[PDB]
Prior knowledge:
By secondary structure, the protein is α/β, with parallel strands linked by helices. It has one domain (about 1-360). It contains nine helices and 14 strands. It has helices spanning about 45-55, 120-130, 145-165, 200-210, 220-225, 235-240, 255-260, 270-290, 320-330, and strands at about 5, 20-25, 35-40, 70, 90-95, 140-145, 170-180, 245-250, 255, 295, 300, 315, 320, 345. Helix 2 packs across helix 3. It starts with a strand and ends in a 15-residue tail after the last strand. The structure holds 2-acetamido-2-deoxy-beta-D-glucopyranose (NAG) and 1-(cyclopropylmethyl)-2,5-dimethyl-pyrrole-3-carboxylic acid. One of its GO terms (biological process) is negative regulation of canonical Wnt signaling pathway.
Amino acid sequence: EDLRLHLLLNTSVTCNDGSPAGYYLKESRGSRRWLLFLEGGWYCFNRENCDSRYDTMRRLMSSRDWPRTRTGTGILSSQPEENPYWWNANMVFIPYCSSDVWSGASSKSEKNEYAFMGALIIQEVVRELLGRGLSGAKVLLLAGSSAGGTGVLLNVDRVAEQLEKLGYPAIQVRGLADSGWFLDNKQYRHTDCVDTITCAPTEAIRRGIRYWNGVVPERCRRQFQEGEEWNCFFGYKVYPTLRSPVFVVQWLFDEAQLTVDNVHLTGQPVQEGLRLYIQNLGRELRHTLKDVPASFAPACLSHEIIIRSHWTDVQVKGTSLPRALHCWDRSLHKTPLKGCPVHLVDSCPWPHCNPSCPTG
Ligand SMILES: *[C@@H]1O[C@H](CO)[C@@H](O)[C@H](O)[C@H]1NC(C)=O
Ligand SMILES: Cc1cc(C(=O)O)c(C)n1CC1CC1
């Protein structure tokens, strides 16, 4: 319990229910690296689904019940044993309380029951951190898992530009998107988009952006143009437009991807049709990562990675994620490094064909 809660001093930057948003902080004064981690936790795209999320997932919509401290785990750990990558860095955990994939900039009003301000939350956290040491940082790594991973892709360049416009050109802004690299593919079996689970990837974001007034990166916006900004929530479409360095971590068989595709791998037989579907999904994911030079994509069926305590255990081609991220750091001090790889994408075609996949 090393990270201390700070509620945002600008109380107009709010969680869904209007309570102040905020962040958890552990300073490391002998370090110029800052890690800002964006929590995940799905989203809600209408008043009905958000009302239900407020009833039984309230911490994802309100700061009123947040604990005063948080323990940093995984890449947020300060223990070298647990975090061989960035154990000495300044650590920031930003709770997800906007249900908007970190894309909203809409104040709650007489007209709107809920505020969706995820993008403004990130900007306001960054602004208040400047006075707490971030002003002297050498690297600001914006990281996130699941909806937070998509949040990284939607916000990393805005953070970069915010810091330039504020007068801090020296801070190198980078992104680490964990489990937020999704495919807008066809479902294995069609379900009507009623809720977050039974909703096709494409339909979910289309309703979402409208409901949150979601904003997306400018260059991507300008490619897909008006009405079609939902495209920018899918990594393989928004990533090529990003200016900042972004490392992508993505299971080939992400449980949340399989959920929105209406696939449930129990322990019972999988018939030819499901086998084909699952193998094609892994192949398409690989294809989208071919031109992402810094990436870690193991052939596993799993949910999320980088803040779990044993994130160090998985390897692709003999390299762990902490090592790959270290190599990525070195690559940014183009031409590949001897024995320090950064592009690590499994090629085998079925869940757990990588023996180091998390086991449960
Ligand atoms: C506080 O946040 C609100 C909400 O976006 C914004 O309109 C205002 O400019 C902010 N004030 C300061 C001083 O940053
Ligand atoms: C943007 C996002 C966050 C999550 C999540 O599980 O947090 C998922 C699945 N997406 C993709 C959306 C099309 C369905």
